[PDB]
Design a protein around this ligand. Structure first.
Ligand code: J90
Ligand code: J90
Ligand code: ZN
Length: 257
């Protein structure tokens, strides 16, 4: 199986998922100087007031906080998007050290982690159908730097010891993802892909300029998670990020400045 270990990491994925070397792969380096301001972009609309979290799962690659997406409750719209995208889950990618961990980079700068709020286009009826379409998903990307704690993150951090190993899940209700957003919704956007296999080219990426601050103790707790299942040799869950991929024939647009 693919992973991020010594022998099955990102440079190996193409052998099972040939679209790894495709025309619209993610993440990418965001060259701030060459991203053009696009005054036709709209403000992003993040409507998470009715979000219903249900569960948190260690899937052996990251942990996902899953939402009830059976009704139009936590939606992302506007920005570069046409139509309405419903929140299904969020997860993070992070490093073994504070100097690395994000998937997207900003003029080659790597952040300590990166949060992905994953949304699917309601015109496709469900997630599984949406990932088959070029405009199927919108992922809202938010950088994490180490500094002041993020109080809105602590409930997530505190449950991780209950889902240490691959395939563990825990009840995770009433979590409000608004506590994870920075103050500004200024963003960059570009057409890309899932950053893990199956690496489908179905994502409008929206990457916020303003990172959120999390404490060293918070990100330390992410690094105590395990890639392995229970009663297998311990492999800390760290460096679960794909490096920047060739931008190819794509423009990154800025909503600002
Ligand atoms: N193209 S892909 O899906 O990324 C993929 C890549 C590599 C494999 C073989 N994996 C391994 N082979 C040898 N030793 C190991 O320790 C692992 N391992 O770590 O799994 C299987 C699938
Ligand atoms: N890192 S990211 O780009 O935000 C991101 C990556 C993967 C997903 C959903 N995963 C899947 N999607 C479709 N088919 C699949 O088979 C899987 N799967 O097997 O996981 C959602 C978001
Ligand atoms: Zn992700």
């Amino acid at each position: 199986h693919w992973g991020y270990g010594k022998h099955n990491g990102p440079e190996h994925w193409h052998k099972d998922f040939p679209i790894a070397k495709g025309e619209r792969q993610s993440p990418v380096d965001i060259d701030t100087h060459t991203a053009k301001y696009d005054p036709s972009l709209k403000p992003l609309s993040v409507s998470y007031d009715q979000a219903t979290s249900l569960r948190i799962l260690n899937n052996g690659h990251a942990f996902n906080v899953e939402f009830d997406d059976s009704q139009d409750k936590a939606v992302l719209k506007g920005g570069p998007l046409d139509g309405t995208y419903r929140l299904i889950q969020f997860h993070f990618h992070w490093g073994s050290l504070d100097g690395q961990g994000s998937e997207h980079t900003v003029d080659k700068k790597k952040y300590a982690a990166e949060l992905h709020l994953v949304h699917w286009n309601t015109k496709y009826g469900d997630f599984g159908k949406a990932v088959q379409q070029p405009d199927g998903l919108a992922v809202l990307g938010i950088f994490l730097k180490v500094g002041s704690a993020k109080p809105g993150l602590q409930k997530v951090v505190d449950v991780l010891d209950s889902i240490k190993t691959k395939g563990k899940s825990a009840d995770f209700t009433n979590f409000d993802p608004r506590g994870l957003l920075p103050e500004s919704l200024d963003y960059w956007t570009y057409p890309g892909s899932l950053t893990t296999p199956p690496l489908l080219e179905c994502v409008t990426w929206i990457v916020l300029k303003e990172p959120i601050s999390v404490s060293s103790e918070q990100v330390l707790k992410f690094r105590k998670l395990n890639f392995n299942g229970e009663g297998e040799p311990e492999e800390l869950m760290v460096d679960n990020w794909r490096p920047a991929q060739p931008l190819k024939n794509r423009q990154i647009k800025a909503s600002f400045k």
